[PDB]
Ligand binder design. Structure first.
Ligand code: MG
Ligand code: MG
Ligand code: MG
Ligand code: MG
Ligand code: MG
Ligand code: MG
Ligand code: MG
Ligand code: MG
Ligand code: MG
Ligand code: MG
Ligand code: MG
Ligand code: MG
Ligand code: MG
Ligand code: MG
Ligand code: MG
Ligand code: MG
Ligand code: MG
Ligand code: MG
Ligand code: MG
Ligand code: MG
Ligand code: MG
Ligand code: MG
Ligand code: MG
Lengths: 70, 149
RNA sequence: UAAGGUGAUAUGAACCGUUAUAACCGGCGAUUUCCGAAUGGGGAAACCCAGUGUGUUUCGACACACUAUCAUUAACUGAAUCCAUAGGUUAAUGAGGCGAACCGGGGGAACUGAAACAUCUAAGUACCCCGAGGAAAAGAAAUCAACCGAGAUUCCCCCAG
RNA sequence: UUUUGUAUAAUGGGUCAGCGACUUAUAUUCUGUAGCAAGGUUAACCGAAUAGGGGAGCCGAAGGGAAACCGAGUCUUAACUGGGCGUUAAGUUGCAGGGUAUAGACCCGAAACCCGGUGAUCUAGCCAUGGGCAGGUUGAAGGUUGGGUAACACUAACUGGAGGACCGAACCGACUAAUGUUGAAAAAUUAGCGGAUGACUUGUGGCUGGGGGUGAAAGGCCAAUCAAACCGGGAGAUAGCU
RNA sequence: GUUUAUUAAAAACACAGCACUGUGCAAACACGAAAGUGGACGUAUACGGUGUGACGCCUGCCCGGUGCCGGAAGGUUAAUU
RNA sequence: UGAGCCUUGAUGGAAGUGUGGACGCCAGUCUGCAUGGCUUUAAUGUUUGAUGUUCUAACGUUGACCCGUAAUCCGGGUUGCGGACAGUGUCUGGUGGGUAGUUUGACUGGGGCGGUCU
RNA sequence: GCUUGACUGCGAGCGUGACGGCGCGAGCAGGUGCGAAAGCAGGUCAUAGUGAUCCGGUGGUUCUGAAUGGAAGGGCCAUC
């Protein structure tokens, strides 16, 4: 639902089988929290994968300079 | 797989590894409170300009914290009875306080966060050994004893 | 603009007007109870109850006026913990609800057809949800072409059933 | 009307009046007719709008082969023969009509499926808070006392007052028969009947929502509707049937 | 005692009792996309599910089939590399 | 405890007397030590896959305590217990009338049973 | 006894089918076998011994191959 840093997902899709299922699929990603900011100290964001790995090449700061600004 | 410890800690690197390091290990421990690392351009080059003012520690800082085992060893016997009783046991709680607080029985003070004793101390009265563990770099020695009252 | 005129089902009564502020029409205003986003709190809608200020006051009162919630900023206050934050107060802005269709987007059938039925169809239609405009959307090539070249998107006829 | 066949006692219609069912769009092909002719014709659009302009393009004058390719020929085969398909068939564009295609496609009609809302003012459960039960009967446990036991048990009376206890109004329910059956009544009336301090009965308000609820269980009940409620929508569902 | 409101009141449902089975508590199980709630402000003398249906005397043989419970050495075997 | 590189090993200072490990077609040689004048394969470094140990530091906590707060929610903090487990997301094998969509022919002296469909 | 005509490419003209299709067939071309030779042989005395299409598999071929040369893939022929 979140993965805040990055968008998210929760888009639907149909999970076909052998030929076809007109069913539906959805909810993905995950969560976690408690991220230590070099500054004061951690607010627990509920990012997920692709969100967690993002806080790496990036920052922790710029990775937050948005969930604030905008 | 790329960090810069600088403050080596049993890790296969000192002064900060510039080559393949461990990963995910630092995301939550090493980096936080421990030894920040980001071996990413920015932080990297900044390590070059270093580290005399930062290295003077092993020479100076170590000294301003190594005299520990020397400043406190000849210490007069620690006479802090831990309420020895119970037909041969005790009442006083021997854990962290009496160990360290056994120094300001005259004035000097320390920090309870430096004790070195894996097992909790059996509530005895004998020569309670207290291996003062101020810093990894320097260890000290203290004692504790219980009396009857 | 003007001799009439006081809306209609019915006059009638009592009247206003004929010159140029009587009507009547058009513009800008003034007023505009209670309910309703309803916003001071509550509430079986048009009812019930309060706080804090006010004027006239025969100076109890009448009514009036403000007081919802969020967001941005401002200043002031401010925990566990020095700090700092969390939180709190105030204030100025702003939102909130309606709305026919077209439009972008999130979610998304089945009857039906296949002369049965699962792939497939119906159809991304129905519907439900969010959002914005007067149109929206798209849009100045990591486009296409074929060794010639064209030159953003959009809409129309062809290419072709 | 439907049938092999109907006066048929097979179907439909009490009667009259008004309304009531092969349409429409584009595409394709024939026929008639008109224009022009190896040529016919424009589309969008422009517009001094039904003009005129616009020939992008569509069709035909060439066909054969799976195609490259060849071409009144061409495929076939190694074949130069034969055999298949072609070769001195005028087409094309309107207009009106016959048919077909895509559409609701002559008209009326399902039982149903799917989507979104409205319904627990009936009823089923449950929650909270209140109310009701004339009278008469039986008479448990416990106890007091006498007896009696070393002490109890045991017993006798008296007191005591239990119980999905007894009889029976209210109240609740429905086993039987008659009547009613275009009723007084879309389930009742009359005479009997079962429970009636209990898993009782009832007022008020609240909570469970449809593939869902509730169910001392019958597929029962969920507003005279239930093997999947009602309302609106997809919707002119589909109907090789009448 | 309950039941087919409106053709069935019964031998049917329920019942107390019995048995099997599950559940160590954030219980099993159920409602719920989740948060959360019921179970229960209970905790194995408790709660659930299944069957039998006071009480009396009882409840025999079969584990081949299916299901369930335990084992899991060996055979077969998914994504993945 | 496996395996990759490959690091160190055994095949492919001048005589005599001796000690040990090596294996056999066996009658033997190999091989350290005093006096005397590349692969077949093993260990350590490792890289990496396995089980199993323990730790805290992600993660859980429907334990306690402190604030926000004269809250049972929630959040922060301290502390405890659990701990790379649990649990979640993607993928994947089971099981799956719990639910859903359907199929389940015709001929026939009615139909069904039987029989037959070339 | 000798052999491979259970041949390859075509086919006048017929029979039989709603159609798909099925059957008969002299004769022609290239190469065969048997016979001295005329000649016979295009499977079995004849009539049952069978499965359309699609999706593919295998071999062959410059038929095609999306800028071009290839290639994949498609066609064509043979066959499962
Ligand atoms: Mg109000
Ligand atoms: Mg209000
Ligand atoms: Mg069908
Ligand atoms: Mg008849
Ligand atoms: Mg008749
Ligand atoms: Mg008529
Ligand atoms: Mg011919
Ligand atoms: Mg009774
Ligand atoms: Mg009768
Ligand atoms: Mg009666
Ligand atoms: Mg009675
Ligand atoms: Mg009620
Ligand atoms: Mg009903
Ligand atoms: Mg439809
Ligand atoms: Mg209809
Ligand atoms: Mg009874
Ligand atoms: Mg009945
Ligand atoms: Mg009855
Ligand atoms: Mg029974
Ligand atoms: Mg079923
Ligand atoms: Mg269907
Ligand atoms: Mg039949
Ligand atoms: Mg024969």
């Amino acid at each position: 639902m979140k993965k805040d840093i990055h968008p998210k997902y929760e888009e639907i899709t149909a999970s076909c089988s052998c030929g076809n299922v007109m069913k539906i699929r959805s909810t993905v990603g995950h969560d976690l929290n408690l991220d230590v900011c070099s500054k004061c100290h951690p607010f627990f964001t509920g990012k997920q994968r692709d969100v967690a790995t993002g806080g790496r090449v990036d920052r922790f700061n710029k990775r937050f300079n948005i969930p604030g600004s905008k | 797989m790329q960090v810069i410890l600088l403050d080596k800690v049993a890790n296969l690197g000192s002064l900060g590894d510039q080559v393949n390091v461990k990963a995910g290990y630092a995301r939550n421990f090493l980096v936080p409170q421990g030894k920040a690392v980001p071996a990413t351009k920015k932080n990297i080059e900044f390590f070059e300009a270093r580290r005399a003012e930062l290295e003077a520690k092993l020479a100076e800082v170590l000294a301003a914290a190594n005299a520990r085992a020397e400043k406190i060893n000849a210490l007069e016997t620690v006479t802090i009875a831990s309420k020895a009783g119970d037909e041969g046991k005790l009442f006083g709680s021997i854990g962290t306080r009496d160990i360290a607080d056994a120094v300001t029985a005259a004035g000097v003070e320390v920090a309870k966060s430096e004790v070195r004793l894996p097992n909790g101390v059996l509530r005895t009265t004998g020569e309670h050994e207290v291996s003062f563990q101020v810093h990894s770099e320097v260890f000290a020695k203290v004692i504790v004893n219980v009396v009857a009252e």
